[PDB]
């Protein structure tokens, strides 16, 4: 059975996600529109930038995160931002399409759109393969949410200073995830292992994005297209 | 009569403006849309940012500008950017409306929209009064264009280093404007004086904008809404 402390951790992590994820994708009409040079870059920079704001709103609601120093919070968010975005994006990924389907014709992001944002196939190949592995896991919301907070709370990040305290938080959260799968997910004998496997996947995709963003933000006609949030989260300072 | 050298200066300055100003305002569907907190700030930051790109394309076509050092070009553009924008915006200003009418309902920028971008009435009052004084001057295109290049080429800018050389360019251009009015504008006995008067106006509006932008870019939830171009042109570095 689950303890009070562990269902409370699940309760507020599910509500935080409900408060920071919109299944209708309505706010997307406020972005710069898509175009199909790097035609998709403005719309996708806006999208990522909006998502960064939602991830921050999630993290401030993970128990224990708010009490870290501001440095460690920044350090955790900069390193883990893109991964939490790849995880959250799974809710929009459809296997029938192999596209993120955030609406009708315009907000259905195919693979040819990711390239039009300046990313080569070295990112796209393991990314979609990650997205169909995550999709086949048929995660409950409690696990999707828990996995996000576990990813965010890795001490394996550059800049983290109190890796001992954040390691304690990350372990309080794996206990919840393991307990939750064991007692509330039938047929999930293998699931925790596969889920942790996916964190190693993300670190690999993270490196590949950073290599391609670094090359992008060094060409001023492209960094021109980024938002300030994006530049601040993905730069080195 | 006008000299060859002076009609050449007029010829390429009119073409430069035709190459950097779109009377249809079609590119405005690529901005972040307007909303009517500071609801209008994203759409107007995009607008200003796009306009900065057009002013740069104009300046690179003013004769003599391309041969200044890159420092003096940056120095001239940073100081004079907002003024060239206030001047170019006159083409969209209508006295029947007192709004910039860049399209239908959405791109008709009233005065209540400028405030929704975070500007107080201390900027708006002399700004529209400037816009109706410029509008009543019924300038020919040769003068509107010439006035812009004269504004851009003021040595009275912070950062300019070769104020002697750019002063020579600005004077080559006032000779063209004076000659042009004298020989090609009937009933313009007073016009050059009034036009130069308007440059003093702009310096006053420039100061008022800078005071209000400075206060805006020091609140990170608002600078968040600016584009990188805007931040780079209007910051101090």
């Amino acid at each position: 059975m689950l303890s009070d402390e562990q269902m409370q951790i699940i309760n507020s992590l599910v509500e935080a996600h409900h408060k920071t994820y919109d299944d209708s994708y309505s706010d997307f009409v406020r972005f710069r529109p898509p175009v199909r040079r790097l035609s998709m870059l403005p719309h996708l920079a806006d999208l990522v930038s909006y998502s960064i704001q939602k991830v921050i709103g999630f993290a401030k609601m993970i128990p224990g995160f708010r009490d870290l120093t501001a440095e460690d919070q920044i350090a955790l968010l900069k390193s883990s931002a893109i991964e939490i975005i790849m995880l959250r994006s799974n809710q929009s990924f459809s296997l029938e399409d192999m596209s993120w389907s955030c609406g009708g014709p315009d907000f259905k992001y195919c693979i040819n759109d990711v390239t039009k944002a300046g990313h080569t196939l070295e990112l796209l190949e393991p990314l979609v393969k990650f997205q169909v592995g995550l999709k086949k896991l048929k995660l409950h919301e409690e696990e999707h949410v828990l996995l996000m907070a576990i990813c965010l709370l890795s001490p394996d990040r550059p800049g983290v200073q109190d890796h001992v305290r954040i390691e304690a938080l990350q372990d309080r959260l794996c206990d919840v995830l393991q307990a939750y799968i064991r007692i509330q997910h039938p047929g999930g004998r293998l699931l925790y292992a596969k889920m942790i496997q996916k964190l190693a996947d993300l670190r690999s995709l993270n490196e590949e994005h950073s290599k391609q963003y670094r090359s992008l933000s060094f060409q001023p006609e492209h960094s021109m297209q980024l938002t300030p949030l994006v530049l601040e989260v993905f730069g080195s300072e | 009569m006008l000299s060859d050298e002076q009609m050449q200066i007029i010829n390429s300055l009119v073409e430069a403006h035709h190459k950097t100003y779109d009377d249809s305002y079609s590119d405005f569907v690529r901005f972040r849309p307007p909303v009517r907190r500071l609801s209008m700030l994203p759409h107007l930051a995009d607008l200003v940012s796009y306009s900065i790109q057009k002013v740069i394309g104009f300046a690179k076509m003013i004769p003599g500008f391309r041969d200044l050092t890159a420092e003096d070009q940056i120095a001239l553009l940073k100081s004079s950017a907002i003024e060239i924008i206030m001047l170019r915006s006159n083409q969209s200003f209508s006295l029947e409306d007192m709004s910039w009418s860049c399209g239908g309902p959405d791109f008709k920028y009233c005065i209540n929209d400028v405030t929704k971008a975070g500007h107080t009435l201390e900027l708006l009052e002399p700004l529209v009064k400037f816009q109706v004084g410029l509008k009543k001057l019924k300038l020919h295109e040769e003068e509107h264009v010439l006035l812009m290049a004269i504004c851009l080429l003021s040595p009275d800018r912070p950062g300019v280093q070769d104020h002697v050389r750019i002063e020579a360019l600005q004077d080559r251009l006032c000779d063209v404007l004076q000659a042009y009015i004298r020989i090609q504008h009937p009933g313009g006995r007073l016009l050059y004086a009034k036009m130069i008067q308007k440059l003093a106006d702009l310096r006053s509006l420039n100061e008022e904008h800078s005071k209000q932008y400075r206060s805006l870019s020091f609140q990170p939830e608002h600078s968040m809404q600016l584009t990188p171009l805007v931040l780079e042109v209007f910051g101090s570095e």
Binding site: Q53, I56, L77, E232, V233, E237 | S223
Partner: peptide, 10 residues
């Protein structure tokens, strides 16, 4: 440094 990220974190 990181003016925005500090702001968004209250």
């Amino acid at each position: 440094k990181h003016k925005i990220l500090h702001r968004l974190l209250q």
